[PDB]
Amino acid sequence: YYWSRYRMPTQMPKFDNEFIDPIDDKFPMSIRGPLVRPDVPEDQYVDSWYICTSMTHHMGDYRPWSASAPPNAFRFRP
């Protein structure tokens, strides 16, 4: 059938206000850093549709700031 495509099942992971993890969220700001994502160049992020976060067009595989500027660049300027 056409619907036979939409039948693959995903297995549950194997273990050993709302939406927020208290342990990570309650960590002190001055230590955790006022950041919600890795500090890589913003060209790697795309505003996710239907989700209130920003994901990367490359799955993981973060590139540092020095991967975009010429070698030994000042302030990562071209």
């Binding site: 059938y1 056409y2 619907w3 495509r5 939409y6």
Partner: protein, 49 residues
């Protein structure tokens, strides 16, 4: 009867209203448009003759 006419449509039921399953598959972007550029098996005989 040939064994390639598979029933793509599922059995009618309340699923087609209750769920968000599509009633057709999406168009294939990288599939060429079908056009007729063949020989009727008789034009070849005509040209050979």
């Amino acid at each position: 009867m040939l064994s390639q006419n598979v029933a793509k449509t599922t059995v009618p039921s309340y699923y087609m209203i209750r769920t968000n399953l599509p009633h057709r598959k999406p168009q294939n972007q990288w599939e060429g448009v079908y056009y007729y550029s063949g020989i009727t098996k008789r034009q070849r005989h005509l040209i050979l003759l």
